[PDB]
Amino acid sequence: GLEELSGRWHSVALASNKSDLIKPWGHFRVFIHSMSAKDGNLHGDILIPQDGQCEKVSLTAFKTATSNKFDLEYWGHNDLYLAEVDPKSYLILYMINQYNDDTSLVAHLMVRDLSRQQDFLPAFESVCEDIGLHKDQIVVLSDDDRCQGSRD
Ligand SMILES: CC(C)=CCC[C@@H](C)CCO
Ligand SMILES: [Mg+2]
């Protein structure tokens, strides 16, 4: 179950229909570090880049009545969906974000093994297509080494 998502993950790519959300300074330009399951809720420590420094924040995505849908408060309300996952290799999620009368779609790919990140970018591109994003709305994070001290 959810507990198999526990442990170390590495962010590979983001996508959004609102480019500002995933720009280098954007609300959802954050790096996953680790996840854990507690009470069937999904807990996650993320790393937030901030002017050469980096903040570690613990978030909880709360289970809902819908399988694989979670409530996450982060820059507004998010309906967080676990779209595709192999707990031992990769995880694709997307969120419907409600913030200040704006509604946006944000997707996120993470992997267990960064040397394999190329293996799963196509699966991410396909999920993005299915939720209506195009390939030019994807940002690959391989040039963004901020928070490198915390991302080991
Ligand atoms: C709460 C959790 C396990 C993960 C949050 C992931 C989003 C904040 C990713 C954003 O791009
Ligand atoms: Mg590098």
Side-chain angles (χ1 to χ4, degrees):
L2 211 50
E3 56 284 357
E4 278 323 292
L5 307 189
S6 93
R8 186 62 227 272
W9 292 93
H10 305 275
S11 303
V12 173
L14 314 166
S16 181
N17 51 12
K18 183 162 161 45
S19 62
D20 279 352
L21 293 180
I22 59 173
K23 285 298 179 176
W25 60 88
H27 294 166
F28 288 90
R29 171 76 73 107
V30 301
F31 301 91
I32 192 64
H33 188 97
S34 43
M35 295 198 287
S36 72
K38 296 163 12 183
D39 314 72
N41 300 322
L42 185 56
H43 297 261
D45 290 0
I46 61 160
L47 296 164
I48 300 165
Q50 273 246 310
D51 208 293
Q53 260 154 30
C54 283
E55 185 186 6
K56 185 179 261 79
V57 176
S58 290
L59 301 177
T60 304
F62 291 90
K63 262 212 200 190
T64 74
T66 294
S67 299
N68 284 157
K69 175 180 173 283
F70 299 80
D71 282 323
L72 170 67
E73 304 305 301
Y74 193 69
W75 288 108
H77 169 73
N78 300 284
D79 298 317
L80 186 153
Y81 293 86
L82 300 183
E84 181 172 325
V85 55
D86 174 350
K88 297 290 87 201
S89 55
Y90 78 111
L91 180 164
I92 295 161
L93 57 86
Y94 61 86
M95 299 163 263
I96 301 166
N97 172 254
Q98 302 252 31
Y99 179 75
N100 289 339
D101 302 331
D102 279 20
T103 54
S104 307
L105 243 190
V106 175
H108 192 129
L109 166 67
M110 50 185 79
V111 298
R112 294 291 198 175
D113 171 12
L114 262 188
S115 63
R116 274 192 80 197
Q117 62 177 281
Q118 54 271 49
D119 297 348
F120 302 104
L121 267 157
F124 187 58
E125 304 191 39
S126 171
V127 166
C128 283
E129 291 207 1
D130 294 344
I131 62 183
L133 304 174
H134 64 76
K135 313 218 160 203
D136 291 321
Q137 308 180 293
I138 294 169
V139 173
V140 178
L141 295 176
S142 56
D143 62 13
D144 191 352
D145 287 335
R146 290 174 300 162
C147 306
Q148 65 205 315
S150 286
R151 289 164 62 192
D152 281 70

